[PDB]
Design a protein around this ligand. Structure first.
Ligand SMILES: COc1ccc(Nc2nc(-c3cccc(C(=O)Nc4ccc(C(=O)O)cc4)c3)cn3ccnc23)cc1OC
Ligand SMILES: [Cl-]
Ligand SMILES: [Cl-]
Ligand SMILES: [Cl-]
Ligand SMILES: [Cl-]
Ligand SMILES: [Cl-]
Length: 268
């Protein structure tokens, strides 16, 4: 959890800019581990410790692993590096990634989210930008800064202060009632699917969050990305069921993705 600054080596170049993120290496006794280190500039510190507390409890092949936290020139969260980075950016720069490969990756995210659902955690920022690639065929979920462990007696988290929120990824019940459940995450996952099959295009382009709400309330949903297979667009639309009760969970979604992926595999 608490790491030795002497064992961390940071590169100058930032990968991104809350703070910055930088690549580094962390020494074990016989190897070094390549790391991504989130580096802050009270509120920020509190959020980092909270995020670390959530990551600490998670153990799944499709979730980014925390190495630990470090308190030196600034506060640092140190994670196992996913070398290829955010999926949205990857797909923008790699437009000939095959449909079978996109299905493989979004299924992996679904398996990560099924685990998160079973663990009774809500992610609350599930977007393509927060899916990180280890390889072209291996995705992990990251960014647990808004994530919450559900109370033992509640199936949702009730936000109080509408913070700075990724509205275009949020279900109607999140915007209208400030209620966040694993089924809200399923909604976000449908948006993440749309982004993936759109090769990292932004959702609801040109629209204000307000117009998104109006659109969704009309019953309108985003169109099928070019080359996106029927079966996958149907699954997006099922993720975007307006009524939480009738919206599937991740067990349901993962299985549908699983079965389809095996069909696509069997073709060939
Ligand atoms: C430059 O390419 C990258 C390659 C690997 C990574 N890897 C990793 N990055 C992060 C990380 C943390 C905090 C913030 C960010 C971040 O700034 N992401 C991001 C996502 C999307 C965009 C964009 O759409 O332009 C720009 C930046 C990324 C965490 N991680 C945990 C394990 N591996 C990583 C990041 C890269 O750029 C942001
Ligand atoms: Cl250093
Ligand atoms: Cl060494
Ligand atoms: Cl909040
Ligand atoms: Cl947004
Ligand atoms: Cl599999």
């Amino acid at each position: 959890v608490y790491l030795d600054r002497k064992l961390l080596t940071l590169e100058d170049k930032e990968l991104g800019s809350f703070g910055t993120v930088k690549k580094g290496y962390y020494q074990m006794k016989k190897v070094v581990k390549t790391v991504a280190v989130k580096i802050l500039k009270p509120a920020l510190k509190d959020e980092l410790l909270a995020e670390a507390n959530v990551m600490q409890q998670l153990d799944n092949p499709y979730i980014v692993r925390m190495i630990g936290i470090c308190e030196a020139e600034s506060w640092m969260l140190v994670m196992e590096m996913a070398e290829l980075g955010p999926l949205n950016k990857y797909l923008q720069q790699n437009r000939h990634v095959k449909d079978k490969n996109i299905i493989e990756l979004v299924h992996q995210v679904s398996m990560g989210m099924k685990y998160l659902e079973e663990s009774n955690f809500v992610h609350r920022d599930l977007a393509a930008r927060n899916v990180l690639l280890v390889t072209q065929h291996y995705a992990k979920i990251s960014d647990f800064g808004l994530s919450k462990a559900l109370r033992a007696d509640e199936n949702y988290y009730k936000a109080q202060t509408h913070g700075k929120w990724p509205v275009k990824w949020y279900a109607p019940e999140c915007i209208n009632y400030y209620k966040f459940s694993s089924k809200s995450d399923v909604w976000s996952f449908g948006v993440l699917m749309w982004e993936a099959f759109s090769y990292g295009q932004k959702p609801y382009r040109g629209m204000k969050g307000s117009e998104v709400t109006a659109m969704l309330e009309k019953g309108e949903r985003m169109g099928c990305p070019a080359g996106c297979p029927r079966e996958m667009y149907d699954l997006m639309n099922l993720c975007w069921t307006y009524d939480v009760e009738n919206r599937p969970g991740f067990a349901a979604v993962e299985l549908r993705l699983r079965n389809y992926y095996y069909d696509v595999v069997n073709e060939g």
